[PDB]
Amino acid sequence: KDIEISASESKFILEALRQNYRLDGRSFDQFRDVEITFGKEFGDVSVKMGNTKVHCRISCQIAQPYEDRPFEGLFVISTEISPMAGSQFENGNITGEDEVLCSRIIEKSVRRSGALDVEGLCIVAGSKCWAVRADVHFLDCDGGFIDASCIAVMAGLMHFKKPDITVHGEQIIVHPVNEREPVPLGILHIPICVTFSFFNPQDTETNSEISIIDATLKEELLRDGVLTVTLNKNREVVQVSKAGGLPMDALTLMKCCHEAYSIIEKITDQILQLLKEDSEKRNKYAAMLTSEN
Amino acid sequence: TISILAAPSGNYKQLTLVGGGAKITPEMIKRSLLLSRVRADDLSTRFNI
Amino acid sequence: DRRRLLGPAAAKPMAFEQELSLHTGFIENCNGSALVEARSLGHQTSLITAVYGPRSIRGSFTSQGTISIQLKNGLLEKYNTNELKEVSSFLMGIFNSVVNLSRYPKSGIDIFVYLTYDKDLSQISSLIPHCITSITLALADAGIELVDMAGAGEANGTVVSFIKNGEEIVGFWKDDGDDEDLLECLDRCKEQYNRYRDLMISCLMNQ
Amino acid sequence: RLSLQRANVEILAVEDKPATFSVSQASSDLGETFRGIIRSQDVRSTDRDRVKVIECFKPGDIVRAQVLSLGDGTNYYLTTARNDLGVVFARAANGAGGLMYATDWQMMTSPVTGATEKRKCAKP
Amino acid sequence: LEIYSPEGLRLDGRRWNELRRFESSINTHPHAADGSSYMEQGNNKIITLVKGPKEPRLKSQMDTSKALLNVSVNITKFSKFERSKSSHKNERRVLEIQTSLVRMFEKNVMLNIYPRTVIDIEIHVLEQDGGIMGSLINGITLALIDAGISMFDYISGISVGLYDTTPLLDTNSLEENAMSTVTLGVVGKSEKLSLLLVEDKIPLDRLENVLAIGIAGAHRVRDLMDEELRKHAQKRVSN
Amino acid sequence: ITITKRNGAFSDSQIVTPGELVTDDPIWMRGHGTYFLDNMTYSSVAGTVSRVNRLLSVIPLKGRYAPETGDHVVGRIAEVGNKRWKVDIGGKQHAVLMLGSVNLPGQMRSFLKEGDLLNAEVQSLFQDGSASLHTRSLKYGKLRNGMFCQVPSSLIVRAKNHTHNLPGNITVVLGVNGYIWLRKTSQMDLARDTPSANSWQIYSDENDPSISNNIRQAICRYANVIKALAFCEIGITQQRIVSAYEASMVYSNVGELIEKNVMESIGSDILTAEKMRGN
Amino acid sequence: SLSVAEKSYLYDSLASTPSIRPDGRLPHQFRPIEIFTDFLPSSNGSSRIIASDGSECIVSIKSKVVDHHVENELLQVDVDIAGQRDDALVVETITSLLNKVLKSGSGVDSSKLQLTKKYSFKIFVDVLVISSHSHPVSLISFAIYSALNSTYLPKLISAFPTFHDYDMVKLDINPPLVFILAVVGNNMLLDPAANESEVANNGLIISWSNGKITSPIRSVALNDSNVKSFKPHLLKQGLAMVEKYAPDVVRSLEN
Amino acid sequence: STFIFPGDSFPVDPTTPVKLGPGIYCDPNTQEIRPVNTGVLHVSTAYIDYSSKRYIPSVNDFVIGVIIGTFSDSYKVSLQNFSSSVSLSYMAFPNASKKNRPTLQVGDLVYARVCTAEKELEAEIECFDSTTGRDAGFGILEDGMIIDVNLNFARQLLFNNDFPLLKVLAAHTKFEVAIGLNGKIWVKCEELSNTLACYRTIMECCQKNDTAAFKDIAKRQFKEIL
Amino acid sequence: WSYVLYAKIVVLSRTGPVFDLCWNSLMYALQSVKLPRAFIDTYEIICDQTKSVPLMINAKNIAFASN
Amino acid sequence: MSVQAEIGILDHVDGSSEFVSQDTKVICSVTGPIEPKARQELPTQLALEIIVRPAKGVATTREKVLEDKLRAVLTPLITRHCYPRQLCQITCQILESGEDEAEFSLRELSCCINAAFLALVDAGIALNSMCASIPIAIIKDTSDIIVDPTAEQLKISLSVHTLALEFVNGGKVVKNVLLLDSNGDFNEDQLFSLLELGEQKCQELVTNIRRIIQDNISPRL
Amino acid sequence: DVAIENNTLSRYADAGNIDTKNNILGSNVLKSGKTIVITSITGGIIEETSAEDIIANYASVYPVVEVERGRVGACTDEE
RNA sequence: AAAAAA
Ligand SMILES: [Mg+2]
């Protein structure tokens, strides 16, 4: 199934971008306001960008590490898209172009960037360790798959706390949540992805390019180029992925890194704040229940 | 359709009832559970296993 | 695995006078079926062969039929999947000469051979003549036209299939064993062929 | 399925020769069953030009026809021009209602709910 | 081990701006594909076969306007010194590379002049030792040219690693495991990048200086490919 | 058996490459291999610069067969649907053969089906470059009574007549597409161009009932020499074939012509002979 | 994919008593090939073979260390054909066939790979078929043969694990060969061409080791159409044909 | 108001003859009338108004479709995403011709009405009403911009003249507009800023769904672009 | 250590719902299961090729299927 | 048994709903009637594509059972003969288990039924009647019947149950039982005592559901 | 009617002669009418490292049902 | 796999 776009729409939106206007009434360097809501359980996190709605749930289990890396842990991400986001997406399709792209992008942002400590997830070297799984649920599709799934995963991992484990010989025991408090996973830095959409309009023909940030579903179908840069508050590039599309200068590439750094810094302080507000939310509730005993 | 897992002890295990073509009167459940008890009691002791 | 129930992946598996019985047409799910059971010395073999066809293929322009054979492991997981494909390729090289393909244009015949029980007190070489016996029975029971009755025998790991009363050969399988057994194996398997042939013909007439 | 200029079906059984029939066993949920197409001009000899296909056949209705030309190796070309050919067995509302019987050649009624639907009926 | 000596040398003895052994090959398999190329960059040995433009297999895949560009990268198990027991055929990292390479050449190759056709690119990596993504690009570029397929310009690949404050050009596997690398794809002699790829951590402070070496370094890669192509062209035009 | 074991390893013509500026003169007419961008002409492929009259273009070093109106080609039926036939002429696309472009005598699969070879003429061209085949002639029709062999499409130049009769009672059909058909010389082949100055069996699948061994080995030898000339990248003409067929008579057995040192011998023999008696 | 007019021509030509091949070859003639060796430094051994029709096969030889008491098979042959699946019918067939051709208790000496009483060298054979216009079983066979003739392993130091850091061992063994034959009418044919196999009545796969015919020996159907039964005298003739013309091909590929 | 639920008893007596309509279902066997949707029952005529974002082909309905394919017999036009295609004949245009065919490319917006719409047959539309002067705005819609809304907002806008949308927008700007019953609204102005102002209003009005909030939204939207 | 029971059920000549027949066959199969003893001289585990004990399941909970 | 539900939370879908019961939260979405695939086409009736995904991991055979049980409920509800040869995509995503997903899947099943029916209403599909599903369990010790239990109540439970009934005439008269699932040790007396309390509590949620629709649908009209 | 054959395919089929190759712990052949069912039980050993009639005390087996309809491919929704 | 002039 494919989305049918009229010729009138394609001419209207393109002309509007030349007049620095867009449908949702935003700027070119502006990112959609992101609200983050945590569920009852730890690790459960809902992220919403405009009309785009996603869901994430962090889990864990006791498993055995690879023979190649016995001193490390295990990490895996599920980005399978259900038709819930739209009939455009087929049921059970991992061979999707933009689908495997979003999976690898956020994988490179977590694993190869040293964001999550896999060495601290190792219980017994070469025997048993922790296996952290992150399942991304794509509820509504208005665009910005990469961006929204990047925040949901990161915010979830920092809000997730694994049960405390004590080693007794070769036997591995698990402490209940009521007896002991779960230990949070160690995160060295928080990577956040920013998606760019490029356009090359006609008429007013020598030099003309349009680049916007976090395009909607209608703007995503009309773009001639795709760019995703991942940055953190540590003044460093986590990862950047540009495959083909509209050929661009190296100056415009770093021009998009400067516009993105102001965006990722703003929402990372938002995540840490909403983590702080939720951490104290569970603290004041724990003291109130005890006082009525 | 009606799916029953009956035991020789008299109790039951799995009970699956889905009506999609006609109403399911309680008299037919009792008739089903009756027929399922004898069916399960017959299969319990048949080949002396 | 999200398809089946494989259970815990951190676990490990367990670590520790020729006689024939022929029955055909006992499966109502397909067009033709056959049951072959053979017991000899300390080695018995029981396998089931199902034949589905001939069924029309949409858009097919083939002027003849198309045979597909697949062997399966019913119970004991012994034979490698790679080896099962090899025998399957060998079996199809046989029945493409046996089956009158000119009768079924734009059609295809699928043949499923389930290897149920095989006790042993090469290796798969001994089962080959029984697979040929089963298929030839299942095809003849299904209504598929066969130019001749296909049968075979196993002698010192050397399997050779015969038709036209042993006068010609429709298949040859030589694995391990020894040398200079060319004339001997051809004579010993020819006796097994004639024996398997008459019992196959009798099987179709009686029931 | 029903289209505007034609009506495609699937072959189930074939009438023998001197009634007895030969049932073709196949899976209807796969598509391995032989498919056939009845042209709008092959519906009836009366007024071959203009024929309303909606008022002739219906999805699920059983149609007795005679094959003219095999054409290609995909679809068969049938016809219901004669009297003994047409919709034989059918139900009201695409099979939702009760059974209907053939009275007139161009009218099918149901002596149960009193419903009448326009079909192409054969001769008893 | 010592990756970068203070005297300005590496493990192989190359400088910070020295490329590895660069040898190209055109029309190596005229009996297999319409165009063929054998990229030998350092220890990397890649066979690239371009089949097309030709009629599609089934009518399911056909474009009435442009052509269909498909890329299959077959990473052999005997590439690296340590043989992988599992096939890389359906691995995520391969499905990414294949799709990326397509998007790269989709705009470079003139698909609009080859309508209702299919251009198939089969790639076999016999051996890989760092900068494999860049080498794959050089393999496709030459192979597409030999097949006589019209494209706008060259697309040259290069891998740039960063050790401390000193960048490196055309890195090997040992260096890729010891530092962060930046793979590039350059359209012609221009400063426009067709492909930008960064996996590991890289300081935002030093980025322009990294790309500038990569773009210029990829330009010498283009010249070496241009030299060999013209060298091969003048020999067969001699007759 | 022959082996080659090597260890350790695996008015001028301007050569241009993709991206290179061929000329700064916008006057010229843009042809193949060149794209227009701001009054400048750039090359899209790698090859020689072709300046003919007003038309400017670049000839690729290698490329598939380009169908032109009037080309005599040999093709194989790839698929048959509706009222058309789609024939493979080894081009970029499948050539089409309409039902009105063949000869109906007094179910299309009963005439031509998948696999059948034929020779035809390119009647016209589509906008996508596809060719429309036309078999309405006494010189065109379904092929039989011989064997097929394939040579590069750039080794057979256009000509007034592509069907030549050769000594040994055989006939060659040199297609511009590179697809060649050798067959026994028939009644039509014997007297074709001569009577000009002076029908249900045309789609038959069966060959001539009597094929002498003298013709089979001729068909065989004529095939080995053509692929030999192609091995040396020599343009195949009717004269090059006859010469090669006679030059290969120094080898008693026909099978000796399959060798690499033998093919290059026959090829070099014609190159030196035409150079010696040509000057 | 030949027309019936071509198939009927090639059959009548091959089935004739003075059998005329389309390329003029005698029933025992082989088509000219080209073999490259030792072109992969990362691997212990490598080979590449080009055929007349344009068929190409790359075989890589690598090795590791493991206990030979826990591993019965010290020789694993993997086949990957371009444009083909790993679970394909033809692929897994050849994969299973070559493993029987090259086995520790079939056509390969197990004492040759023996270093110590505890540990031994296990050889991994990888096969990459670039192009295939026919049955590559014979083509791959000649490639694996030349690949094992030119091989270099880490040289041992002690006796009965440590290796030599520079000097290497050259494995000298007698690798088996596989010759595919074509049965057309009453005549036997060696090295069947692409177009010959499509009209052949039947076919034979015969192995060869140490100047003698050995297992595996199969009777493969080169096509799916003109496949017919054959007289027993053809099997005796074919085997004898391989027997006498094998020292010729072995001698050629030895250089 | 009287709210209705599916399966509930029908208040209307079966004695007096009552014409059917959308929302209610006549059981082909038991011959009883039951509601199948959720909403307000309107009795003048008997039908049920229910919230739906998906359009279904029906006779005498004005729809805005997009050409997704051009055949030799007719046009393939999609009135909505993922829905089945509709058949737009070549003779369904004013001043039709035999050999000469109307000029429409793939992607062109067409404003037509549905002539014949069967449940078990491919629907058909015609670019000329049958008839209202042959010009109710029917034909190709050049340029402009379209917006996706629910079916409830579309029908009330086209039929009901008391709807304060065309009344409040006419004061803010001068424009021509076409509204389809499939949830499509096509609006074209002179300047692009006006079309953008109209798009943002309908987008917000459909979301909030308030009759008295039309003038408030339109005031702040047109003053936002300046 | 703990035992884990893997089961494989093949169905031939399917007519109607086979869950009822698959359950009954599995129940009869479970009624007669022998668990071979294990022993050991990271260490592996070795099962005896002869000695075994019958599986003890609750006969009071054993049920049967019908549709 | 206090629950919470919302209608039309998704934009690009024809109809959607978000059901909340205790801790288990299952959001659903419905698109239709739309163009069906060739393999799903039904000449007379309407095709149903049902997809159920868990809160953690990938959909397995467990969810295949959930889809099969959910299909049995939604099938007689929808009037299939109103949309001949068409498609209806029903996707149910579980946000939170609300129980032990490894041992019990009957809590999530009822929530998948409830959420789906609400989405069917929002999407505007022809329904023959109404429906409501509740999870039931029986503790081994107390031997009491608990309607809509919690997570800890299931762990010590002897038998788990699932009831889904079809309601007509103002959500009072019961036409027929749509779904009745039961797992665990129980007798015949406990069964008829289950429907006695179940039918009462089912109608309690029916009238509860009905008022939810009114509050959401009416402002749109 | 129901007729079965128990312990016919197991290694413990015969008391005296025990199969050294067969790994089947328990087996059953069943045929009710036309449909035939063949069940085979295998086993395995797993190291347990963690820390009354309830759900946690009772376990189950992992069945792999293969319904043969004569079509190749993956496991159907039935299985 | 329709098309252009009159
Ligand atoms: Mg492969």
Which chain A residues touch H145 with a CB distance below 8 Å?
A: 8-9, 12
- Please give the Cα distance from K7 to K22 (Å, whole number): 12
Task: Please give the C-alpha separations between residue H12 and each of H16, H46, H49, H114, J174, in angstroms, as whole numbers.
Answer: 8, 9, 17, 31, 22
Nearest to E121 by CA among E49, E229, E186, E210: E49
The two structure tokens encoding residue A218:
């209608």
Give the pairing of strands G119-131 and G75-81: parallel
- Residue E18 (CA) to nucleotide L5 (C1'), in angstroms, measures 67
- Please give the Cα distance from B24 to J177 (Å, whole number): 7
Cβ contact, residue pair J84, D59, below 8 Å: yes
- Report whether F151 contacts F236 (CB < 8 A): yes
Does residue H131 have a cis bond before it (omega within 30 degrees)? Answer: yes
- Please give the Cα distance from H173 to H189 (Å, whole number): 8
Residue A121 contacts by C-beta under 8 Å, 6 or more apart in sequence? A72, A73, A74, A75, A129, A130, A131, A132, A185
Residue E92, classed as helix, strand or coil, is helix
Which one of F30, F48, F65 terminates a domain? F65
The two structure tokens encoding residue F167:
């000594």
The coordinates were experimentally obtained by X-ray
List, edge to edge, every strand of the sheet that includes J173-186: I64-66, B2-6, B12-17, J173-186, J157-168, J130-139, J145-147
CB contact B2 to I (< 8 Å)? yes
Nearest to G72 by CA among G97, G99, G45, G93: G99
Rg (CA), chain F: 22
- Report whether F89 contacts F176 (CB < 8 A): no
Beta strands, E only, D1-124 = 6-10, 13-15, 21-23, 35-39, 63-64, 66-69, 75-79, 86-87, 90-91, 99-104, 107-109, 116-117
- The secondary structure of F107-175, three-state, reads CHHHCCCCCCEEEEEEEEECCCCCEEEECCCCCCEECCCEEEEECCHHHCCCCCCCEEEECCCEEEEEC
Q: How far is CA J174 from the centre of its chain?
A: 17
Number of domains in chain C: 1
Dihedrals phi, psi of D5, to nearest 5 degrees: -100, -5
- Report whether A255 contacts E205 (CB < 8 A): no
- The answer to whether the C-beta of H34 is closer than 7 A to strand L is no
Number of domains in chain J: 1
Q: Which domain holds residue E203?
A: 1-239
Indicate if F36 and F120 belong to the same structural domain.
no
The two structure tokens encoding residue E211:
């790309």
Nearest to G182 by CA among G245, G141, G236, G234: G234
| Angle in degrees, CA G37, G38, G43, rounded to 5 | 130
The two structure tokens encoding residue H21:
């309509």
Strand L: which of residues 49-108 in chain H lie with Cβ below 7 A?
70, 72, 99-101
CATH number of the CATH domain containing D32: 2.40.50.140
- Report whether E53 contacts E149 (CB < 8 A): yes
Q: Which domains does chain H have, with CATH numbers?
A: 1-52 (2.40.50.100), 53-143 (2.40.50.140), 144-226 (3.30.1370.10)
Residue with CA nearest L2 C1'?
H72
Alpha helix (H) residue ranges in chain E: 92-108, 132-146, 173-176, 208-236
Residue G7 contacts by C-beta under 8 Å, 6 or more apart in sequence? G198, G199, G226
- Please give the Cα distance from H27 to J129 (Å, whole number): 13
What one-character DSSP code corresponds to residue A182? P
Which chain H residues touch A23 with a CB distance below 8 Å?
A: 196, 199
Number of domains in chain D: 1
Which one of F22, F50, F65 terminates a domain? F65
Residue G68, classed as helix, strand or coil, is coil
Q: Which domain holds residue D57?
A: 1-124
Per domain, the residue ranges of chain G are: 1-255
Nearest to H82 among J34, J124, J168 (CB): J34
Q: Which domain holds residue C165?
A: 1-207
List, edge to edge, every strand of the sheet that includes E22-23: E22-23, E35-41, E44-54, E118-127, E68-75
Number of domains in chain E: 1
Helices (H) and strands (E) in chain B, counts: 1, 2
CB contact G100 to C (< 8 Å)? yes
Nearest to J127 among H3, H36, H52 (CB): H36
Number of domains in chain A: 1
Give residue F162's identity as a one-letter amino acid code: H
Residue J2, classed as helix, strand or coil, is coil
Cα H29 to middle of ligand 1, angstroms: 59
- Please give the Cα distance from A231 to E207 (Å, whole number): 13
Cβ contact, residue pair I13, C27, below 8 Å: yes
Number of domains in chain F: 2
Give residue I15's identity as a one-letter amino acid code: T
- Please give the Cα distance from A114 to A106 (Å, whole number): 12
Q: Which H or E run includes C73?
A: strand C66-73
- Please give the Cα distance from C40 to C130 (Å, whole number): 12
CB atoms within 10 A of CB C174: 27
Beta strands, E only, chain H = 3-4, 24-26, 33-35, 39-43, 46-50, 62-70, 74-78, 86-89, 109-116, 124-126, 139-140, 145-148, 176-179, 184-188
Task: Please give the C-alpha separations between residue D26 and each of D9, D10, D75, H163, in angstroms, as whole numbers.
Answer: 14, 11, 16, 58
Nearest to A100 among E95, E187, E198 (CB): E95
Q: Which domain holds residue F135?
A: 66-188+202-279
Going G77 to G80 to G86 to G91, the CA torsion angle's sign is negative
The two structure tokens encoding residue F10:
């695996």
Residue F243, classed as helix, strand or coil, is helix
Tell me which nucleotides of strand L come within 7 A of a protein CB: 1-4, 6
Residue E217, classed as helix, strand or coil, is helix
Give the pairing of strands J3-7 and J15-21: antiparallel
- Report whether K24 contacts K40 (CB < 8 A): yes
CATH number of the CATH domain containing J91: 3.30.230.70
- Count of residues in chain I: 67
3-state DSSP percent of chain I in helix, strand and coil, to 5: 20, 40, 40
| Angle in degrees, CA E85, E87, E91, rounded to 5 | 125
Which chain C residues touch G215 with a CB distance below 8 Å?
A: 157, 174-177
Indicate if F117 and F246 belong to the same structural domain.
yes
- Please give the Cα distance from D42 to D65 (Å, whole number): 10
Please tell me the class of the G1-255 domain. alpha beta
Q: What is the largest CA-CA distance in chain E?
A: 62
Whether F1 is covered by a domain: the verdict is no
- Please give the Cα distance from G252 to G254 (Å, whole number): 5
Dihedrals phi, psi of J13, to nearest 5 degrees: -100, 150
The two structure tokens encoding residue F38:
């701001």
Report how far apart the first and last C-alpha atoms of chain J are (Å, whole number): 31
Residue I26, classed as helix, strand or coil, is helix
- Please give the Cα distance from A162 to A121 (Å, whole number): 10
Give residue G118's identity as a one-letter amino acid code: K
- Residue J217 (CA) to nucleotide L1 (C1'), in angstroms, measures 50
Q: What is the DSSP string of F179-228?
A: EEEEEE--HHHHSSHHHHH---GGG-----S---HHHHHHHHHHHHHHHH
What one-character DSSP code corresponds to residue J43? S
The two structure tokens encoding residue J81:
């003969």
CA atoms within 13 A on the CB side of H126: 18
- Count of residues in chain D: 124
| Residue J146, beta-bridge partner list | J137
Cβ contact, residue pair J53, A82, below 8 Å: yes
Give residue B11's identity as a one-letter amino acid code: N
Rg (CA), chain H: 20
Burial class (CB within 10 angstroms; exposed 0-12, middle 13-18, buried 19+) of K34: middle
Nearest to K25 by CA among E49, F197, I30: I30
| Residue C115, beta-bridge partner list | C47, C73
- Please give the Cα distance from A132 to A187 (Å, whole number): 13
| Angle in degrees, CA K67, K72, K78, rounded to 5 | 35
What resolution (Å)? 3.3
Nearest to A8 by CA among H110, H77, H139, H86: H110
What one-character DSSP code corresponds to residue A81? P
